[PDB]
Design a protein around this ligand. Structure first.
Ligand code: MG
Ligand code: MG
Ligand code: MG
Ligand code: MG
Ligand code: MG
Ligand code: MG
Ligand code: MG
Ligand code: MG
Ligand code: MG
Lengths: 218, 129, 88
RNA sequence: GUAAAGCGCACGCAGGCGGUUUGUUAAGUCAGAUGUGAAAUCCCCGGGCUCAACCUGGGAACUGCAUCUGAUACUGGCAAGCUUGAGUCUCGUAGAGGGGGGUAGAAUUCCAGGUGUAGCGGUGAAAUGCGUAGAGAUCUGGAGGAAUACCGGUGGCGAAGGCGGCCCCCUGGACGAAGACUGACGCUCAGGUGCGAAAGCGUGGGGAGCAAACAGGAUUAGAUACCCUGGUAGUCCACGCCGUAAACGAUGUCGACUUGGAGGUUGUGCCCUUGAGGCGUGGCUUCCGGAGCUAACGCGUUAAGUCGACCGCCUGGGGAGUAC
């Protein structure tokens, strides 16, 4: 397991005949991710990544999952990276042209209450909109500054962020996901057989890829 | 029942190729072999073996290429209860040539092209594209 | 349908060796057994159609076995029929 | 599968198809040659009418049949086997499978008697009806017929239709276990033969309950109905007949492949079996669903997916499954 010997396998017995080629056993009534053959996908997943990362490539990081969120919000903050850990909308990729605009408000309204342009007019007015920003930074505050379409994307577990891969593969965006047992490794052209959660597991691989990303650009 | 042995091999092949499988098992026979040979000598299968001395099997290895299987299509032709025999100037051309037509001649069971040039016709077998 | 001794008995009487019940002879004989004997269970009841249906099986199965013999060997056939007066 | 279309289901003659090895034959098969396939059409190249239509030289072709000479993979014949198909033996397991004969209890109806006295029954209300000749209720005894609560279930069995108390007799199939044996004896099947819910028919029994018909009472504008009170065939039995049904999974039989999940029923191997229990490995069977299929709904290893042997059937709707 190289070092990732802190998650091994997961997903009781629901599994998926597709993720089959990525199991060692099923002890304790649950398949065991063959980390012995995961090592390739492990460190290598970052290989093809650093390449596009060096070109200042726009790499996204999805993961709405409650546990991942708090950790993913920092993952992409490694430098020139973007994150999306709050319910992947249905268009922030395939129909960006629209959502990309909704972001504007987020900007201004933010910089507004951010500087001096906020405590003006009536209080009720501001008070009512002093929240809108928040909700916006959740589903955009992380993928906002993104200029246009991301060079690629890296999502935690396929199943959950199903829509993420869908809208992507439609545009032709590389799929860097960590599919395990239940997960479906078909939407991900970059198979990464590994747990779909576990704080100790996610974090380990979260900042993991970031390496080749930050180490990629010169 | 197994009134048609040949068909079994053909079908067992495409079916496996679809489910993405290394090789395929099945009791071999004199003809099943010669036919399987051509499938190899022509580029459709890695290799093949015949385990069991008393009861012969057939470790027919399936071949693939990119994100798809090599055997794009294979159907039976001279099926039983409806045999098919063609002359030297009758032998068809599978997929305008990009395919193969296994034919059994009095000189052996080779491909259409080979049998055709040899100047002899024979009972067709299948049209492995 | 039949009995241990009843069966085993007719077996040896037609088996060149032992435990060779597969023998065509043993079969033809073993078949006719419940056959020429079930006649009673059918001479009466009559309405017992379900069990009747099966009666035919051991009759037909026996039929094919005989026709087979006539093809795989004339003698055995023309010699076996007599021991049971079969084929009239 | 639902659009037209799977015989209601079995057995099986003819016919069609036939697991595997060797040898042999050389019939089908293929190669060659030889006859012959009239000429004219057609076609190719080329000629001749000023071109063309038209005419014409030569060749190609005439899909074919016959004979001869080979070739032998494949189909067939034949000879010898071979065991995985099929089957026989052994031992067990499960079962509302079938025919026969008994039998048990609950209830209904009717009869007789006691106690008892003004109702009961039924409805949306009502009425018809049963009650002072004493009902109803309740108790005691008796007669008779039909059906078998609970178990009982996504359950089980059967070819289909279908099959439920218990007991016995006679009997058909299915499944596992490890072997023993026969050695392709197989798969399908026009016609044919047989089985076939219910109703219906005949003869003769039986007849409690239910109930077409029929009679009353209501309802209604009418009510040849729905509701009520009665009630005949029939329903039950034996023997014979009639062959139909949404005889439905609306999906023919047989064999081989093809990701998975959960549950039921019944069998068996191994296991601290110590133990309920763990690991398997068969038959049948529910529901969910992937690939793919599908016009969609949906089907999905019990396929409507991928294939092979055989059969049945469809060809617009109405007329008409009628007429003859
Ligand atoms: Mg209709
Ligand atoms: Mg129809
Ligand atoms: Mg049917
Ligand atoms: Mg001519
Ligand atoms: Mg031969
Ligand atoms: Mg009747
Ligand atoms: Mg009658
Ligand atoms: Mg059944
Ligand atoms: Mg389904």
């Amino acid at each position: 397991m190289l070092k990732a010997g802190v998650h091994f396998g997961h997903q009781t017995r629901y599994w998926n005949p597709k993720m089959k080629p990525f199991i060692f056993g099923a002890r304790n009534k649950v398949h065991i991710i063959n980390l012995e053959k995961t090592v390739p996908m492990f460190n290598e997943a970052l290989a093809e990544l650093n390449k596009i990362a060096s070109r200042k490539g726009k790499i996204l990081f999805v993961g709405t999952k409650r546990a991942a969120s708090e950790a993913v919000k920092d993952a992409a903050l490694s430098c020139d990276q973007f994150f999306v850990n709050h319910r992947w909308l249905g268009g922030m990729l395939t129909n960006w042209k629209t959502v990309r605009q909704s972001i504007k408000r987020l900007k201004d309204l933010e910089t507004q209450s951010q500087d001096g342009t906020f405590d003006k007019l009536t209080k009720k007015e501001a008070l009512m909109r002093t929240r809108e920003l928040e909700k916006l930074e959740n589903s955009l505050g992380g993928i906002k500054d993104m200029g246009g379409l991301p060079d690629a994307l890296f999502v935690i577990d396929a199943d959950h962020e199903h829509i993420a891969i869908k809208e992507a593969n439609n545009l032709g965006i590389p799929v860097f996901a960590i599919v395990d047992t239940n997960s479906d490794p078909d939407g991900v052209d970059f198979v990464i057989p590994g747990n779909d959660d576990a704080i100790r597991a996610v974090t380990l691989y979260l900042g993991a890829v970031a390496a080749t990303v930050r180490e990629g650009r010169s | 029942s197994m009134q048609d042995p040949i068909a079994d091999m053909l079908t067992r092949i495409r079916n496996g190729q679809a489910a993405n499988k290394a090789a395929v098992t099945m009791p071999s026979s004199k003809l099943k072999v010669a036919i399987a040979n051509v499938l190899k000598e022509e580029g459709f299968i890695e290799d093949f073996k015949v385990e069991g001395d008393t009861k012969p099997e057939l470790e027919l290895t399936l071949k693939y290429f990119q994100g798809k299987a090599v055997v794009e299509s294979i159907q039976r032709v001279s099926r039983p209860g409806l045999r098919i025999y063609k002359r030297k100037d009758e032998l068809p051309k599978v997929m305008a040539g990009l395919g193969i037509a296994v034919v059994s001649t009095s000189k052996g069971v080779m491909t259409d092209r080979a049998a055709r040039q040899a100047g002899l016709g024979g009972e067709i077998i299948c049209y492995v594209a | 349908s039949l009995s241990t001794e009843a069966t085993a008995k007719i077996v040896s009487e037609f088996g060149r060796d032992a435990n060779d019940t597969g023998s065509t002879e043993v079969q033809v004989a073993l078949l006719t057994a419940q056959i020429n004997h079930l006649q009673g269970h059918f001479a009466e009841h009559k309405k017992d159609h379900h069990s009747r249906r099966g009666l035919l099986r051991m009759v037909s199965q026996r039929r094919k076995l005989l026709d087979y013999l006539k093809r795989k060997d004339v003698a055995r056939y023309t010699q076996l029929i007599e021991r049971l007066g079969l084929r009239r």
